[PDB]
Design an enzyme around this catalytic site. Sequence first.
Site, mmCIF file in Angstrom:
data_model
loop_
_atom_site.group_PDB
_atom_site.id
_atom_site.type_symbol
_atom_site.label_atom_id
_atom_site.label_comp_id
_atom_site.label_asym_id
_atom_site.label_seq_id
_atom_site.Cartn_x
_atom_site.Cartn_y
_atom_site.Cartn_z
ATOM 1 C CB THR A 159 -95.219 -1.095 -27.901
ATOM 2 O OG1 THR A 159 -95.007 -0.968 -26.506
ATOM 3 C CG2 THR A 159 -96.705 -1.113 -28.157
ATOM 4 C CG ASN A 180 -91.401 0.961 -29.250
ATOM 5 O OD1 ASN A 180 -91.988 0.202 -30.036
ATOM 6 N ND2 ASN A 180 -91.962 1.366 -28.133
ATOM 7 C CG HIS A 309 -94.036 -5.436 -24.004
ATOM 8 N ND1 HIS A 309 -94.285 -4.714 -22.824
ATOM 9 C CD2 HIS A 309 -94.332 -4.620 -25.031
ATOM 10 C CE1 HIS A 309 -94.670 -3.498 -23.182
ATOM 11 N NE2 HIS A 309 -94.675 -3.410 -24.521
ATOM 12 C CG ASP A 683 -77.507 -18.283 -41.199
ATOM 13 O OD1 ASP A 683 -77.671 -18.010 -42.399
ATOM 14 O OD2 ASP A 683 -78.132 -17.721 -40.262
ATOM 15 C CG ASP A 691 -75.086 -20.204 -45.387
ATOM 16 O OD1 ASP A 691 -76.118 -19.464 -45.130
ATOM 17 O OD2 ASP A 691 -73.954 -20.007 -44.870
HETATM 18 C C1 YNR Z 1 -100.064 0.508 -30.798
HETATM 19 N N1 YNR Z 1 -101.157 1.418 -31.117
HETATM 20 C C2 YNR Z 1 -101.159 2.796 -30.984
HETATM 21 C C3 YNR Z 1 -100.087 3.610 -30.509
HETATM 22 C C4 YNR Z 1 -99.796 4.945 -30.831
HETATM 23 C C5 YNR Z 1 -98.715 5.248 -30.108
HETATM 24 C C6 YNR Z 1 -97.880 6.482 -30.000
HETATM 25 C C7 YNR Z 1 -97.662 7.112 -28.578
HETATM 26 O O1 YNR Z 1 -96.232 7.211 -28.814
HETATM 27 C C8 YNR Z 1 -96.330 6.268 -29.913
HETATM 28 O O2 YNR Z 1 -98.330 4.177 -29.377
HETATM 29 N N2 YNR Z 1 -99.227 3.112 -29.639
HETATM 30 C C9 YNR Z 1 -102.405 3.203 -31.403
HETATM 31 N N3 YNR Z 1 -103.149 2.121 -31.784
HETATM 32 C C10 YNR Z 1 -102.376 1.079 -31.593
HETATM 33 C C11 YNR Z 1 -102.739 -0.334 -31.854
HETATM 34 O O3 YNR Z 1 -101.921 -0.849 -32.917
HETATM 35 C C12 YNR Z 1 -102.071 -2.186 -33.123
HETATM 36 C C13 YNR Z 1 -102.927 -2.933 -32.346
HETATM 37 C C14 YNR Z 1 -103.054 -4.274 -32.604
HETATM 38 CL CL1 YNR Z 1 -104.188 -5.169 -31.651
HETATM 39 C C15 YNR Z 1 -102.301 -4.894 -33.603
HETATM 40 C C16 YNR Z 1 -102.413 -6.296 -33.898
HETATM 41 N N4 YNR Z 1 -102.451 -7.402 -34.195
HETATM 42 C C17 YNR Z 1 -101.433 -4.105 -34.357
HETATM 43 C C18 YNR Z 1 -101.287 -2.751 -34.114
HETATM 44 C C19 YNR Z 1 -100.340 -1.925 -34.983
HETATM 45 C C20 YNR Z 1 -101.212 -1.005 -35.851
HETATM 46 C C21 YNR Z 1 -99.481 -2.858 -35.851
HETATM 47 C C22 YNR Z 1 -99.377 -1.070 -34.157
HETATM 48 CA CA CA Z 2 -95.996 -1.981 -25.256
HETATM 49 CA CA CA Z 3 -78.131 -18.588 -44.584
#
Ligand code: YNR
Ligand code: CA
Ligand code: CA
Length: 804
Positions: A159, A180, A309, A683, A691
């Site tokens: 994720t 992760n 994914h 590489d 390289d």
């Molecule tokens: C993944 N997430 C979680 C979250 C918290 C946890 C905990 C539970 O155990 C871990 O899991 N997921 C909360 N809010 C998001 C959304 O994050 C995003 C959403 C979008 Cl649309 C994009 C793009 N482009 C980028 C992000 C990041 C900020 C880079 C992650």
């Molecule tokens: Ca995911």
């Molecule tokens: Ca290289």
Amino acid sequence: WTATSGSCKGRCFELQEVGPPDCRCDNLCKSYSSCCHDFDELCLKTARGWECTKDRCGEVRNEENACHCSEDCLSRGDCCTNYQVVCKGESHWVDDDCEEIKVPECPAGFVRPPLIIFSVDGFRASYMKKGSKVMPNIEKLRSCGTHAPYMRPVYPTKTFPNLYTLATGLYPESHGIVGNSMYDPVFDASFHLRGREKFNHRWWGGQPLWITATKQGVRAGTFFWSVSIPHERRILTILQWLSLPDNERPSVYAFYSEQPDFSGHKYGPFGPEMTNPLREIDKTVGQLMDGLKQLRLHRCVNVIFVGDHGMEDVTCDRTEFLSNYLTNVDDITLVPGTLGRIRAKSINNSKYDPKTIIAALTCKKPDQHFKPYMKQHLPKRLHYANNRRIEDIHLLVDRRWHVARKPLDVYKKCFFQGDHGFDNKVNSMQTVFVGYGPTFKYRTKVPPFENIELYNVMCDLLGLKPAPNNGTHGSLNHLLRTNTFRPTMPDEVSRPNYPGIMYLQSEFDLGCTCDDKVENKLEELNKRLHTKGSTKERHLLYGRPAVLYRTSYDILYHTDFESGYSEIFLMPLWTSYTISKQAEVSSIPEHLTNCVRPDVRVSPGFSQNCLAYKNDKQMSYGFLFPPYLSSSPEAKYDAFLVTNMVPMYPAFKRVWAYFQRVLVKKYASERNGVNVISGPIFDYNYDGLRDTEDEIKQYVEGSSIPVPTHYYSIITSCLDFTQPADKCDGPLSVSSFILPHRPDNDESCNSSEDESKWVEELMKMHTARVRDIEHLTGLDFYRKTSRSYSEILTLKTYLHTYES
Ligand SMILES: Cn1c(-c2cc(C3COC3)on2)cnc1COc1cc(Cl)c(C#N)cc1C(C)(C)C
Ligand SMILES: [Ca+2]
Ligand SMILES: [Ca+2]
Ligand SMILES: *[C@@H]1O[C@H](CO)[C@@H](O[C@@H]2O[C@H](CO)[C@@H](O[C@H]3O[C@H](CO[C@H]4O[C@H](CO)[C@@H](O)[C@H](O[C@H]5O[C@H](CO)[C@@H](O)[C@H](O)[C@@H]5O[C@H]5O[C@H](CO)[C@@H](O)[C@H](O)[C@@H]5O)[C@@H]4O)[C@@H](O)[C@H](O[C@H]4O[C@H](CO)[C@@H](O)[C@H](O)[C@@H]4O[C@H]4O[C@H](CO)[C@@H](O)[C@H](O)[C@@H]4O)[C@@H]3O)[C@H](O)[C@H]2NC(C)=O)[C@H](O)[C@H]1NC(C)=O
Ligand SMILES: [Cl-]
Ligand SMILES: [K+]
Ligand code: NA
């Protein structure tokens, strides 16, 4: 320590972060233990739920309500998303007919159509078809907008790596979020899904879209959502932000759903329990779109519906245990699961030997559901090596399987029926893309593409200049109704030399021999024509590759092939040749088995020599244009020039010979001719980039002949296979590979068998995009075609994946 005793009065979901120890009223505040004492009461109202009913219509505003059905609600920006339906006879957006959006239809004060990114965790590509009958809002977006049949995530198919790729246009090895969970050996700290460490800015590299936006004066909503904020409230927050005054209103927004991932883990991807989460996500999209339509924004806003994914069937009983392979299992740490990464338990250990660990993990059980790799030996298409957080040892795990260290790791933690993280070419890992709005095309299907490309497009959608990234800008132009980015070809930096015959045979002392003293004027001007480029139109179909760095090199022409010969690396950078459907395979005659001939166009001092190969007891040599495909006994002598020779491990020659002798002819039979470009790649620092000389770590013993890390080929033909490759009027079809140049075939467990049982399987695993080879060579291919540059950029990003 916070002073949590200020108030959120009038600051709910405020866009500018206030710094400790004033108290906060934003999405992060929960995850930092820093919310003001009244945040839940003021900012997370729940009273009366999320839908207007007939009885609430026209009500008196009651500020305790979660959302409003009072007459003043459209102006305050805080109506329930279904207000207009219930209270004013309007239709839900899903029930309206699809109508083309030729131009943005925005309220006054909108300088540009807003972008909303709607991300869905674990949303496997095939849900679009298999779940279509329960997702009418999503199906409308998909059939009326622009869609791909699937989008390819990055590896690992986890994720955080994928969402941060979406945001940056970077490979995880570049942005830093390579899993992760992760251990950084400089930080001596671990990143995990639980805990506060993941919040530290030091993990997160590159420049995400929200920062790109802000630096250029475009304002952004939150991309992070607290897990306790219900979806209905995230949607209402976005619609409130969209009612702000012009100078305060964001232009880019994101929404994230934990589903369907969260359920898929429990029930498997197609468990009966998965119907409901798909229904729920669809309802959420309906809310957003009814909410846009109330605010007259449903023909103004660009919406991207995208997943990070897919999801595969994985159960506790399909776990491989390292304890069944290694004696020394307490001397390692494993990052387990759908991939494996192995490091030493203690860096206070000169006794730790990665080679012995690899050896113990290689081809040990006939059934083995994982393969070990040093990270620099992973398929270059994964781009998964150039970071200190990626351990030296990697295990690629088979789809449907897990790897763990010991059994107790699995029972002293079956919970789960689904998981993800495998190889990004795996069908079950593919995810979704839909683009809907004024800037996307209408009712249009595009080919599958990679999530790395979307950053550039989201920048275009917002009029932003993208930060440097790994997409190919213009490759996704065909998604868009109006493009603000017009790609152009990079300028050639080094121009070639075109040497004639300048050296006599006796000027060479290369320790080579050939049986070629075997003497007509009809065919003496005819061969002269060939050394000057008379067949060049047949063998070089798309112009000469452009060299994009400063070097010294020669074009050499031949009856059957053309090359670009580097005087610095003493070998071709590229060799181009066409094989028609009709062409014949022939043998290397007995008298020519060890034949190598000086090239009289190229000085002794810029030539390889046979003596060095004799003396190097590990290293042998092969040829880039294969002698087996000579057009005539006479043309075959040209294949044995010293300028067509390259260093090859005997083990690698098994692979290379089978490709050249059997596979090229097969492809020409199947594809109605192919054009091939083959060459070396260097590489040594595994950065995915060509390289310089001074980075080479291995030479042929006692020479300046550098040893390639990899050999590539680009195999092109006509998309319409009723036309031969050499007379194609239309679009092209390509497949390419980057084969590792390894002195053993340990990677292929069946390599003791005939090449026909294992070589092609290897080559398929090392499939590549033309762009991958460009980065590794500093070449630029397809310079002269009849196709638009946009189309050629799509072609250069194509990957042939060999999934059914
Ligand atoms: C993944 N997430 C979680 C979250 C918290 C946890 C905990 C539970 O155990 C871990 O899991 N997921 C909360 N809010 C998001 C959304 O994050 C995003 C959403 C979008 Cl649309 C994009 C793009 N482009 C980028 C992000 C990041 C900020 C880079 C992650
Ligand atoms: Ca995911
Ligand atoms: Ca290289
Ligand atoms: C995918 O797309 C990306 C982005 O375009 C591209 O990655 C870029 O590759 C460039 C070439 O390798 C590299 O160029 C210079 O790097 C540094 C600048 O470093 C910092 O500044 C930028 C700008 O704001 C940051 O983005 C960058 O972030 C990286 O490092 C962070 C920690 O600092 C980290 O959080 C983040 O994730 C990111 O890490 C990644 O990159 C680093 C290296 O930069 C890797 O080691 C990590 O594993 C990880 O992959 C930095 O904060 C410059 O200082 C370099 O200058 C060298 O080279 C010159 C060539 O002109 C040379 O002339 C000079 O001599 C100079 O050498 C000096 O330093 C040498 C090395 O330290 C030393 O030996 C020598 O003797 C002398 O003192 C580079 O110009 C970009 O940083 C890089 N960006 C990113 C974001 O990764 C990818 O290449 C493509 N991928 C493919 C396959 O196409
Ligand atoms: Cl999102
Ligand atoms: K040798
Ligand atoms: Na083997």
